[PDB]
């Protein structure tokens, strides 16, 4: 008898209100300019 | 007897409100420029 | 006799306000200039 | 009989107000400029 | 019957006000100049 | 002038052996039986 | 005049042996019978 | 003139043995049994 | 005139070896049984 | 005229030998039982 | 259980571009030359 | 259970870009000259 | 059991960019000119 | 049990970019010549 | 059971940028010449 | 020879009268019991 | 020859009476019992 | 020749009488109860 | 020759006559009881 | 030839009478209660 309930997970965000620049989740590799 | 329920994964983001810029959930490379 | 539940993960953000430059979630490398 | 809830981790942040620079959640490795 | 509830870990922090900088949560190398 | 090169993520695995039982990357939740 | 060079992330394993049991990268939540 | 290089992350591992158990890189949550 | 490097860090383990019970890097919470 | 180079951190071990019981990185919260 | 959200009102603009003339918002009264 | 969020007003703007001329949010009066 | 969050207002801009000539929030009145 | 949390208001701006110009936030009233 | 955080006014600006102008926050009145 | 006089504009009500329960001129957003 | 004159806004009320219960101007947003 | 004369701006209300609850001219959030 | 007189501007309310219960001009957020 | 003369501004109330309860002008947050 196993019960699982209700998980999360987040990785960047739930809410992103403005960008006015660069938002970036994930990156490897590369060049930001913001 | 296994019961599961609500499980969630977010990897950007539930809402985005306004972008301005860049956004980018994933990069794997590149040159970003905002 | 198991129960488990309500677990949350964040890993960057929940909120993100206002970005007027360089947000990354995760960087293996690069350059970020802002 | 075992019951777990109720469990929370942030590697980085809830809430991110204002970002007028640069704000990584993980880096590698980089150079950074702000 | 054993039962476990309400435990968290931050570790950068909850609320970020506002970045005029660079905020690294963690960095394994760089050059950071803010 | 901005170099960037040879850089790696992997998130499982890159050489994954013979498989008798259950090898998930990534699951959102459910019942795993081996 | 930047440049940044080899370096990597693993978030599990670069090399995984035989399975006869369950291995699960990343799971959010539920039942794992081994 | 900046130069990062050679540098490396493991969340878990690089090199797995053989399972005949259960091994979870990240579980948010759940039961497992071994 | 900045360089940095060969630098490193390891969450758990870089080499596992074999597993009969259970292994787990990283869980918000739950049952573990071994 | 800044180096800086081979330094490292291990929050849990390098090398790991087997296992027949349970061991975890990190837990925020719950019931192990070996 | 009642949620409202995300409602936004703009009076004038969100984005106003270059200015050679003039720009008023709002005004009771007056005399106005471009 | 009552939840509220993100309403947004603007009145006159986000951004404004370059002025060479007259800008005004709100005058109850007078006499403006670009 | 009530949440309010994140309502914002702005008045006259978040941004005004280069100024060459009059810019005004709010007047009651007088006499401008650019 | 009430929360509120993160209401904002701005009334002029929140970056204001070069001045060569005259800028003013609120006046009750007078001559502004640029 | 009340919380009530993080709510910001701004009056005139965060960031006022270089100034070779005239910057008045507020004035009850007079002559400004820029 | 321009003569404009005497216009007036009424957003919700010049004169209001005795009320019970909520009275509200402009909302961007919410709950409203009554 | 220009001459402007007696212009009015009223935004709310110019006269308001004795109610009974919240009287709200403007909001951006939120929760309003009466 | 420019003549600007006797115009107003009323945003809440210019004469409040006797109330029996709150009385709020804006709010940007919140909860409010009478 | 301009001319620029008698304008005047009300935010809450130039005559405020005897209430019971809270009174608030202008609120960024939070609670109100009355 | 510039004249502005007899402008006026009130924010809250130039004449508050005999009330009952908390009057607050300005807030940017908290709990008021009357």
């Known amino acids: ?3 699982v309930h ?3 997970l ?8 403005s ?3 660069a938002i970036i989740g994930l990156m ?3 060049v930001v300019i913001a």
């Open 19 to 21: 960008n006015k620049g």
């Open 10 to 17: 987040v990785f960047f965000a739930e809410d992103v209100g």
């Open 28 to 30: 490897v590799g590369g």
């Open 6 to 8: 209700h998980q999360k």
């Open 1 to 3: 008898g196993y019960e």
